[PDB]
Amino acid sequence: YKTIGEIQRRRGNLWFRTYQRYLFSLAYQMFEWQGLPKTVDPIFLEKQLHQRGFVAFYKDEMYGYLGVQGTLSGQINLYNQPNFYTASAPTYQKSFPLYWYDMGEDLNEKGQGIVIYNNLERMPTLDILNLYAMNLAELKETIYVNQNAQKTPVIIKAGDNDLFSMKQVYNKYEGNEPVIFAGKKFNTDDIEVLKTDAPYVADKLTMLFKDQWNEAMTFLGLSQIQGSANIYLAPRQEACRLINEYYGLNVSVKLRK
Amino acid sequence: YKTIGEIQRRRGNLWFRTYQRYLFSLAYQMFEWQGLPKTVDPIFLEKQLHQRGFVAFYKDEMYGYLGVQGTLSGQINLYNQPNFYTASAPTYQKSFPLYWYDMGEDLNEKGQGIVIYNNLERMPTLDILNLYAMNLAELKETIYVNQNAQKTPVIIKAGDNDLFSMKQVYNKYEGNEPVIFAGKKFNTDDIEVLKTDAPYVADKLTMLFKDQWNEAMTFLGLSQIQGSANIYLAPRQEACRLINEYYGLNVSVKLRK
Amino acid sequence: YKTIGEIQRRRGNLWFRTYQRYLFSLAYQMFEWQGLPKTVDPIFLEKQLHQRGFVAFYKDEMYGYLGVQGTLSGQINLYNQPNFYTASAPTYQKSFPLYWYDMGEDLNEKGQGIVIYNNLERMPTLDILNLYAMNLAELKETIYVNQNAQKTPVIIKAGDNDLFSMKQVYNKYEGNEPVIFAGKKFNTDDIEVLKTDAPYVADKLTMLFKDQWNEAMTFLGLSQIQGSANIYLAPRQEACRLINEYYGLNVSVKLRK
């Protein structure tokens, strides 16, 4: 129902959100988990990973496995690995130690948790998309600005003359003769022309749009230049292995195709 | 959630970090170790190698194998090879001699360590990436600067005239006639035009981006010009051989694919 | 962690070292020796050859085979071949005669040594790399200088006008009309434009980079124009033959692939 005027006013800030909500979603569903307990929502895991970079996996006695969010600690190991994970959720404030490698059978109080990383550098994925979206929107705006410039390549300066008379000849102009300004109506001694031309480049500002889209796909992992999703895949597999070690759960991870 | 204005302000310093954290991670996981003891974290080894260039491998009595960092010595061999390795970690300050070749059975007190090199020149890998990242970011900024220049190819100088009247004709301009400035409203005797054109080259500043990315891949070893990862592979294999010689451990190294 | 500003200041002197330490290493490991005694380090041999051009091979009674460095003599043979080899190492100053061809069984006191050449002209390999590195770095700097020139193709001279007003119209410029400078605010009688254009050639300053890299590979032996590593291979084989003649050791040499 929205009228065209309601959109022409806000143009850059709509393309941006449109592409932002699209790329975020297209990322949230890049990985497919299996063998998980029916209590944890995978969508929550993926969202938290992509937004923040990490998420904890610590079983609770009453509630259950309770895939949970929170912060990391400053008390670390010799190998630059944290020790305990405090939650940041408003209702829950539980804390728990973490588990990285096995230490015989007498490892700990069996109350530890496991953490998952979006990538070895704890870098969220939104920092790339929030940029490529901006680029694509700026491009879609530049394209309009450059296409709307092919209506006004020239201007005519008619100082003393009037507009209605000058404009009606162009209205009753058929084509059997050129345009002619004659009569005492007109002055024809001050008229001039000016070249306001603007080159056409929107044919090339599209290929750039596509290049940017393909670069976003690449640096996202989903397919000049190659892309390796191992950055996001390997830590997940490693944490899955740690989980299957601590417990008896057989978890796996991979793309959707 | 970030608004476009929050990003347009900081542009070069975000692309830089984005590509930096990406290349660093993509390198940290180039090599896959096997047969190692469950006490040493390979990620720590690779990080320390790429950041500094070397890392020691000396077994401790109490803790274990304790893959450890530190400095090198000035007391060297006739073959320009150090003798002992002092640690730089804050909590640990242990020192230990090194082992390069075998000397019968009566070699030493069996308390020596082994060192691993990122490459024969002790050159860290970050020096290449910290440069290619800068190049790529500067390119992504230049591309924006050159695409945003196709909106302002010309300017109109209307000294005595006013802006609202001049700008409303362009608003109620349909297309059945050219643009016409006429009436006592306007002066039409001082208007002029200026060509502020800017060539379009962003179609070529992309191929350069891709060339730089491929060069970074090449000089990294992961695939005009060829790339040899033997620079980073051979010293690792050699140190692995030394380890399997000193001890009975069967270690190996290779890429992930 | 290094910030972009920490690198933009020092640019030429970082690329240089980066490529220098890379080419040196890539050369140190071009040849693979076999059948050697476990006392001599091949890496030392190759380093000394490439750096200086030659290295001696003289067995010692106490220490062992003791692959050693040093200088050459002025007392030469009729065939322009030296006689004795004095060492330059700080701790060792031993001297020993050399062995070039056999003279029956009663050749000498069996205390002679053998020398190895990097090439018939005693030319070290660093003289080529220290040049190609400089060329490549200068190129990587020129490319930046030429890409950063596409932001400032034109300049506008607004003498009497102010900057904020002139710059805000470009900020609230949408695209439905050209740019217009009108009002008593502006003068519009002194504004001018100047063309500061700079051609784009970085698309060709890359192919030159690649040509230089391939030339370095060629003149290094590791693969328009061909390259013969026999320059570095033949004297090594010849010295190996001399060694297998003087002693009973079966040594060999070749590339790594």
Numbering used by the authors:
A (entry chain F), B (entry chain G), C (entry chain H): 8 to 230, 251 to 284
Please give me the paper's original passages concerning this structure.
The Portal Protein (PP) complex is a central component of Caudovirales virions in the process of self-assembly of phages. The PP has multiple functions: (1) as a nucleation point for capsid formation; (2) as part of the motor for loading the genome into the capsid; (3) as a head-full sensor; and (4) as a conduit for genome translocation. All portal protein primary structures are characterised by a common fold comprising four conserved domains: The capsid-facing C-terminal crown, the interior wing and stem, and the tail-facing clip domains. Using cryoEM, we determined the structures of two portal proteins: GA1 gp10, and phiCPV4 gp17, which are phages of the Salasmaviridae and Guelinviridae families respectively. Both GA1 gp10 and phiCPV4 gp17 PPs have the canonical fold and domain organisation found in the portal protein phi29 gp10.
The GA1 phage of the Salasmaviridae family targets the pathogen Bacillus pumilus, causative of serious infant infections. The GA1 PP (gp10) has 52.4% sequence identity with the phi29 PP (gp10). For GA1 gp10 the tag had to be proteolytically cleaved to prevent the formation of rosettes and the buffer pH adjusted, to obtain sufficient oligomeric particles for cryo-EM (Materials and Methods Section 2.2). The GA1 gp10 dodecamer has a height of 78 Å and the outer diameter of 152 Å. Assessment of structural similarity of the wing domains between GA1 gp10 and phi29 gp10 RSMD in aligned atomic models demonstrated that wings in GA1 and phi29 PP have nearly identical folds, which is not surprising considering that they have a very high percentage (52.4%) of sequence identity. The N-terminus of GA1 gp10 is relatively well defined in the EM map and could be traced from residue Tyr8. The N-terminus forms two helical elements on the outer part of the PP complex where the short α0-helix comprises residues Tyr8 to Arg18 and is positioned in a horizontal orientation with respect to the central axis of the PP. Arg18 forms a salt bridge with Glu148 of the adjacent subunit. In GA1 gp10, four hydrogen bonds are located between the α3 helices of the neighbouring subunits Tyr139A, Thr149A, Gln154B, Lys147B. However, there are interesting differences in the arrangement of the clip domain between the phages: GA1 gp10 has a beta sheet formed by β8 and β10 strands from one subunit and the third β9 located on the outer edge of the beta sheet is from the adjacent subunit.
